[PDB]
Structure formats: structure tokens, C-alpha cells
Symmetry: T
Subunit: 21 residues, 12 copies
């Protein structure tokens, strides 16, 4: 599968997360 | 315009946000 | 099917609508 | 992550589900 | 139009459906 | 960026708008 | 609602169609 | 990559096509 | 939920997979 | 296939492009 | 919110940009 | 156009690819 990337900015911290499809 | 609803969920808290289009 | 929701904000007047898939 | 909401509707009944991203 | 295919799995019945665009 | 277009048809009145990405 | 524009192109001819949302 | 499938119904003929991502 | 289908190719080893939504 | 239209805008100028699916 | 990344390649300049959702 | 990025995994042989739009 494909794994995208995104900066998941919550209320306390951001972080690069994958997104698996 | 259309406004979708979503929750921006960080560590362990969420917040309603709109998404305007 | 899945039904999404959105506020359809027209000429100064909104209303929730469904979106079928 | 972002959480969307939709109705998952079957033959007769529906249910709210999250769609997390 | 394009017709996608999906398994609409409900509470007591899955079934292939078209999704038209 | 890419700019898409859509007719925003409100309370009996449409108008072309852009959508930036 | 929003109305996107698209062309439904077959063999070698196209036709404008709307896509309502 | 992922290869989806769709019935591409033009004006003269439909046909299962891939969609490569 | 809806289950779409795709061929998941990597090094010429495709295979049908689901995509749950 | 379906053909969408968008403006591909750079530093200063834009251009119409098709997005075919 | 989620921040995707893309290379916005224009006529005479590519550059990484965020896309916020 | 915009170029997104993803890891294309098949049999544990991932690698960065573009996705042109």
C-alpha cells in the first residue's frame, strides 16, 4: 500500500504521522 | 459554501472545527 | 451507504444537508 | 488526527461512525 | 460517467453496489 | 497552487467561485 | 449546493456535466 | 502503486478501466 | 462501512486488497 | 473518462489544465 | 489540523508548500 | 502541477514516489 505523510498538529504537539492506504 | 464538520483531536482531547468550501 | 453532513450556507441562510454515498 | 462523522446505513437502520484520519 | 464498485456491508447484509460519478 | 471552480448556488442565486489548493 | 464542472469524454467526444453537491 | 477499477461509460460504450495511483 | 477494491502492486506482484471506509 | 478543469498558477501567471480521470 | 506536503512546480520555480486541513 | 509524496510498499520494499496532479 501507499504511505502518505502529514504533520498532525494537535493542541499540544505536532508530529509527522503516516497515513496508510 | 458548504461546511463540513470535523474534530481536531490531539493527545486525548478533541475540538470541533469547520471546513469551509 | 454512508451519509455525510454539511451546512449549506446560501445567500445568508444555512441548513444542514446529507450527502449520500 | 481529524475525525469526520457519517451515518453508516444498512437495510433499515443507521449508525454514527467516525472516520479518522 | 464513472462507476466505482464497493461492498456495502451492513448489519446483516453485504452487497456490491455501484457508485456513480 | 491549483484553483478549481464551482457554482455556489445559494438561496435561489448562483455565482462561480474558486477553490484554492 | 456546489456544482463542479466536468466533461464526460467517451470515444472521441466530450459533454459538459455538472456534479452536484 | 494501487490500481482501482471503474466502469467508464461514455456515449457509445462502457468498459472496465484501471486507474493507477 | 464501504469496501473498495484495488490491485496492490509493488515489484510486479499485484493482488486484490480491500479498502475499508 | 471524466475531465476536470483547474488553473495551474505559478509565481505570477496561471494556465488552464485538464485533470483526467 | 493536518498539513500535507507537495512540490508546487510552476513555470520557473518548484517549491515545497504545506497544505492545511 | 502539485506533486505529493508517498512510500510505495509491496512486499516490504518501500520507496518514495511522486504523485502528480
Amino acid at each position: 500500500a501507499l504511505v502518505f505523510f502529514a504533520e498532525d498538529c494537535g493542541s499540544n504537539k505536532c508530529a509527522i504521522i503516516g497515513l496508510a492506504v
